Amino acid sequence: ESADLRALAKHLYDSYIKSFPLTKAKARAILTGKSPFVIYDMNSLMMGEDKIKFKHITPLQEQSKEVAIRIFQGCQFRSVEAVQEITEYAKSIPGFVNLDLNDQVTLLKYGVHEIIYTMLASLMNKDGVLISEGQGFMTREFLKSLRKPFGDFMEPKFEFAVKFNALELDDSDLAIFIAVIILSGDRPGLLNVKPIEDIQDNLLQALELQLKLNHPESSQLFAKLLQKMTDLRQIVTEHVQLLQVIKKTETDMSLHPLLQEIYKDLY
Amino acid sequence: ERHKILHRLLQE
Ligand SMILES: CC#C[C@]1(O)CC[C@H]2[C@@H]3CCC4=CC(=O)CCC4=C3[C@@H](c3ccc(N(C)C)cc3)C[C@@]21C
């Protein structure tokens, strides 16, 4: 049993690495100074629109407007990327591609943002967030100052990230934590729960052992970590409401078809 | 599976 949980950890870690090119270690280094373009306002945003060439697409929309919009729209590019990376990594969780396709869709639909905010925290410190695969650093204060409702679309994630990073998880820990989140059996509209819960039981055992080996003096880390899953749901449901108020009060800005699918009929 | 982009992502 012990050796198999270990092998399962090792495997997920391996796929976690292939699937997400920029890692916590990689990005923690950059942040501690262990040379990124800094975005602090509009001008330095555009001047950093050649940070990684540009967030293009950059279709022939988003190209455009005031700062909050330009940023809101660049956020969708990166988050389509992320959904693909995540989908990819899910396929690698043993047992997952064996599930009903409808169940597979549901798990990803409901778990994707929880994972996006989990992974984003690796990329943050109290003062700002990395972007463009660590080539840019966007300041927190800039992100708040965004006005209409776009302010505080990111402040809550910073607040969560700062607490989450205090747990000081590494990539090996995060690898299994993310697996566990995807294999959540309480997703609305699951067809049959039993096989998903069987897999999670397994990831949970593996996570528990990982925490004990890797963080031997961190008391009740396993518990503290599952408690973060509630923090995470709040951010997700807060985010969704923001989404709903944009799709009305703000002008008709376009949405990537992939995001529309995930967003429609979810809470 | 009226999440068709996603169904494809998962469908190899
Ligand atoms: C639409 C939308 C949205 C958001 O969920 C809200 C904050 C966005 C974040 C801000 C800060 C930010 C800045 C950019 O310049 C592009 C990307 C970006 C985001 C988006 C994002 C999505 C996924 C990741 N991962 C998986 C590391 C990183 C950044 C989208 C975020 C999270």
Residue A52 — φ and ψ, nearest 5°? Answer: -120, 65
Q: Known binding site: residues of A?
A: 76-79, 113, 239, 263
- Give how far A89 is from chain B: nearest CA, Å: 10
State the distance from the centre of ligand 1 to the C-alpha of A2, rounded, in angstroms. 37
What CATH number is given for A1-267 in this structure? 1.10.565.10
Among A72, A71, A48, residue whose Cα is nearest residue A135: A48
CA distance A82 to A147: 26
In chain A, domain spans? 1-267
- Provide φ and ψ at A69, rounded to 5°: -65, -50
**Torsions phi, psi of A136, nearest 5?**
-125, 160
Q: Which residues of B touch A112 (CB under 8 A)?
A: none
Inter-chain CB proximity A261 and B4 less than 8 Å: yes
Cβ atoms within 10 Å of A114's Cβ, excluding its own: 19
Method for this entry: X-ray
Q: What is the DSSP string of A13-77?
A: HHHHHHH-SS-HHHHHHHHHT--PEEE-SHHHHHHTTTSSS------SSSSSS-HHHHHHHHHHH
Ligand 1, from A26, A75, A81, A87: best to mutate by most atoms within 8 Å of Cβ?
A: A75
How many angstroms separate the CA atoms of A90 and A192, rounded? 18
CB within 8 Å: B5 and A257: yes
Question: Which of A258, A265, A266 has the most B C-beta neighbours within 10 Å, making it the best mutation to test the interface with B?
Answer: A258
Cβ-Cβ contacts under 8 Å, A83 against chain B: 9
Q: What residues of chain B, 1 to 12, have a C-beta less than 8 Å from chain A?
A: 1-7, 9-11
Given a contact cutoff of 8 angstroms between Cβ atoms, the answer to whether A24 and A182 are in contact is: no
The span from the CA of A44 to the CA of A48, in Å, is 6
Query: What's the length of chain B?
Result: 12
Q: Is A81 helix (H, G, I), strand (E, B) or coil?
A: helix
Q: Which of A176, A186, A172, A199 is nearest to A230 (CA)?
A: A186
Token pair 């376009």: residue: A254
Residues of chain B with Cβ-Cβ distance to A102 below 8 Å are 1
- The C-alpha atoms of residue A129 and residue A141 are separated, in whole angstroms, by 11
Which amino acid, residue A183?
L
Determine whether the interchain pair A101/B5 forms a contact, defined as Cβ–Cβ distance below 8 Å.
Answer: no
Residue the block writes with tokens 């703000």: A250
- Tell me the two tokens of residue A151: 């302010």
CA distance A264 to A103: 17
> Residue A72: left if φ>0, alpha if ψ -120 to 50, beta else—which one?
alpha
The residues pairing with A137 across neighbouring beta strands, listed in sequence order, are: A38, A130
Q: Enter the tokens of residue A207.
A: 């996570």
DSSP assignment letter at A152: T
Q: Residues A115, A50: contact at Cβ < 8 Å?
A: no
Quote the CA–CA distance of A73 and A150 in Å, as a whole number.
11
In whole angstroms, what separates CA A180 from the centre of its chain? 14
Closest atom of ligand 1 to CA, residue A243: 1
